[PDB]
């Protein structure tokens, strides 16, 4: 889901 | 006592969505269809439960296309509950199949042949509930044989009387006035008052086509009514409803009396008058009970008595008391009595004798029209004012109606417009008043004027030849206002097309100004209005040669000659070619002032 930006 | 039925109904109700409802219905329909066709014979309880399940499914709304044969199989059953379920299924679901109709008729014939009061009641209710020509042909000869001197139970007599009522309403041709009419009339003397009520309903219906055959019913009914009303409350102990002795039977007897002319027998007419006087005098007595149902029953009997008095209109003394009682009801606290009083007072005002007595209540009628704030009661007050109107006071009635229309919603606006227009037309002592009234209707309502009203105002204006000069002037004054409805534009165009020369002398109303005023409204109007205005433009071409250039220019406009609608283009081209090509004589003779007109 959440990926590092 | 049907556990399967209970669980199925709970499963139907417990569904939280229509999809689950349809799924459960389809599942149970598949189960019941499989169960009817199974090899194991179905006992009566299963047949009854499944037929009742089908009945519930059909009553929910969904269509059922099977299960009729099992239902008819229940008709020929010794148990009462199975028979009841079968008869209910037959009554609710109607199938026009010759074999099934024959089986149903055989079952009903078998039940009627028996002497069981309950089975006869079921059969009679089945005959009365479903009406068909086949059932009438089967049973119209037999049903009269049941409610005649042959000994039958009182409930059976009631059911037979109402079944014959249904068969007569459905098929009057199959119920002829035979020798049974006299002994059907003689049911008005039975001790059991339910039989008397059923007989009264049947005789009331049958008397319209055959007043002479049932002539003795008036003499039999006056005595029964007098024995009912002029008796102590102890009597009729079973049928005394909230200290009012048999209100429904009294109402039915009064209606049966109402369907006949005044009785010829002086003693009978005296009994009827005395009964009516007692009924009217019972009003002033204080109520025996404070409950509203007692007053409701008493006023039901009283209103039926008043309707009888109005229909008879043979006793001038009774009419005064009836009018006074209705006037007292006009200001009653309960709105039901106010509505009923207005409804009955309209009929009273229709009578010629009591015109002044009803006209006396004009102030309270106007007050009820203004401050009641109920749509139905205000409509009844408007109808009464319509009936109450007269040449001596038409102006006040029309003014009040216009004031109410200014504060009337949308639904009754068209009806009020029609009533005001017809009153203004009929009671126009001075014709300058009618034009102003119709202009007021066009201004206030506009959308609800309808075609007939402005048709008729043009009818009145054309024929008079004395109000035309005022009509043209007032319409010119009305058109230059910034707010003008389409009907006002139509009326103005038509009146000014023929009577524009009446006011053409005045500098303010000159042909250029009239044409400019009309062309200002030309573009913002529908197709029929534009076509009517084109006709008015050619009329102006005829009347005023000085304005011919401008009208020819506007007709020559590229927008007019290429209108999408056929009629506008047709009139534009025709009028342009008529103005251009005519030799000023044919154009003159084509356009004239026209002959005068002849729930």
């Amino acid at each position: 889901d959440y990926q590092r930006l | 006592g049907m556990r399967g039925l209970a669980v199925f109904i709970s499963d139907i109700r417990n569904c939280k969505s229509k999809e689950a409802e349809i799924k459960r219905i389809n599942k149970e329909l598949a189960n019941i269809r499989s169960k009817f066709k199974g090899d194991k014979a179905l006992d009566g309880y299963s047949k009854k439960k499944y037929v009742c399940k089908l009945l519930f499914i059909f009553l929910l709304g969904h269509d059922i296309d099977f299960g009729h044969m099992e239902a008819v199989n229940l008709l020929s059953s010794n148990r009462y509950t199975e028979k009841q379920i079968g008869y209910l299924f037959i009554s609710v679901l109607v199938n026009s199949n010759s074999e099934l109709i024959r089986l149903i008729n055989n079952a009903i014939k078998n039940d009627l042949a028996s002497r069981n009061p309950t089975f006869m009641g079921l059969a009679l209710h089945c005959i009365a509930n479903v009406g068909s020509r086949e059932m009438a042909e089967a049973f119209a000869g037999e049903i009269p044989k049941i409610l005649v001197a042959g000994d039958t139970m009182d409930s059976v007599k009631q059911s037979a009387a109402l079944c014959l009522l249904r068969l007569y309403r459905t098929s009057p041709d199959l119920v002829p006035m035979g020798d049974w009419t006299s002994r059907v009339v003689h049911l008005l003397n039975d001790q059991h008052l339910g039989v008397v009520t059923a007989a009264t309903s049947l005789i009331t219906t049958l008397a319209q086509k055959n007043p002479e055959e049932f002539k003795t019913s008036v003499s039999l009914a006056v005595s029964r009514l007098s024995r009912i009303v002029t008796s102590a409350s102890t009597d009729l102990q079973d049928y005394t409803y909230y200290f009012v002795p048999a209100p429904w039977l009294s109402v039915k007897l009064l209606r049966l009396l109402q369907c006949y002319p005044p009785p010829e027998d002086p003693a009978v007419r005296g009994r009827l008058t005395e009964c009516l006087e007692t009924i009217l005098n019972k009003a002033q007595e204080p109520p025996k009970s404070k409950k509203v149902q007692h007053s409701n029953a008493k006023n039901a009997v009283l209103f039926e008595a008043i309707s009888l008095i109005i229909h008879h209109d043979s006793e001038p003394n009774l009419l005064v008391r009836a009018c006074n009682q209705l006037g007292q009801f006009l200001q009653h606290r309960e709105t039901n009595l106010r509505y009923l009083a207005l409804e009955s007072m309209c009929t009273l005002a229709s009578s010629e004798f009591s015109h002044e007595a009803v006209k006396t209540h004009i102030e309270t009628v106007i007050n009820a029209l203004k401050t009641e704030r109920d749509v139905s009661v205000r409509q009844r007050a408007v109808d009464l004012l319509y009936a109450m109107c007269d040449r001596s006071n038409a102006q006040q009635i029309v003014a009040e109606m216009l004031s109410y229309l200014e504060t009337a919603d949308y639904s009754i606006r068209e009806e009020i417009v029609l009533k005001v227009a017809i009153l203004a037309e009929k009671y126009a002592v001075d014709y300058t008043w009618y034009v102003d009234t119709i202009l007021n209707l066009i201004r206030i309502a506009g959308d609800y004027v309808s075609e007939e009203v402005w048709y008729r105002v043009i009818q009145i204006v054309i024929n008079r030849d004395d109000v035309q000069g005022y009509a043209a002037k007032t319409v010119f004054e009305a058109l230059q206002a910034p707010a003008c409805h389409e009907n006002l534009v139509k009326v103005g165009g038509y009146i000014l097309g023929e009577f524009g020369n009446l006011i053409a002398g005045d500098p303010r109303s000159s042909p250029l100004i009239q044409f400019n005023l009309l062309h200002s409204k030309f573009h913002l109007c529908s197709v029929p209005t534009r076509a009517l205005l084109l006709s008015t433009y050619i009329k102006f071409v005829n009347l005023f040669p000085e304005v011919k250039a401008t009208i020819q220019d506007v007709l020559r406009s590229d927008s007019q000659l290429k209108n999408a609608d056929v009629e506008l283009q047709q009139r534009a081209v025709e009028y342009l070619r008529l103005s251009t090509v005519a030799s000023t004589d044919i154009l003159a003779t084509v356009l004239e002032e026209m002959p005068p007109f002849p729930g």
Binding site: - | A128, S159, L162, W248, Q293, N296, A300, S376, G599
Partner: protein, 141 residues
């Protein structure tokens, strides 16, 4: 003449519909939502007597249900209102304070009661005691 008899809850579901005239199912529906829309808008203060179409209906609410009878224009209004009240009282006595569940679970019994009271679109039996005795005798069978 009674044209039909309806019992509706405040939601709008028809718990009884006995028709004394020939009506198509589509037209029967049209009548059902017509009656529902006309009736549920009116409150208790207004008159019980409201006209729609060629006929008119006498309605009266009992708990959540709406008991309405449709009659002709010339029929007696208060008499049919009292007929509604008599019918509701007999229902209350028979079912021991009628609710909606007694109507859904025992629809055939309620049809029997209506047939005993109103037949052929006319008032048939007005006495409560006689109707109750007849219902008891039927139940014993």
């Amino acid at each position: 003449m009674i044209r039909f008899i309806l019992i509706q809850n405040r939601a709008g579901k028809t718990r009884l519909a006995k028709w004394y005239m020939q009506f198509d199912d589509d037209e029967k529906q049209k009548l059902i939502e017509e009656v529902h829309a006309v009736v549920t808008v009116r409150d208790a203060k207004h008159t019980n007597f409201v006209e729609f179409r060629n006929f008119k209906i006498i309605y009266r609410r009992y708990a959540g249900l709406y008991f309405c009878i449709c009659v002709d224009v010339n029929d007696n209004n208060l008499a049919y209102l009292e007929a509604i009240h008599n019918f509701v009282e007999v229902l209350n006595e028979y079912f021991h304070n009628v609710c909606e569940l007694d109507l859904v679970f025992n629809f055939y019994k309620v049809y029997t009661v209506v047939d005993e009271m109103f037949l052929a679109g006319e008032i048939r039996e007005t006495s409560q005691t006689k109707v109750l005795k007849q219902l008891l005798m039927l139940q014993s069978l």
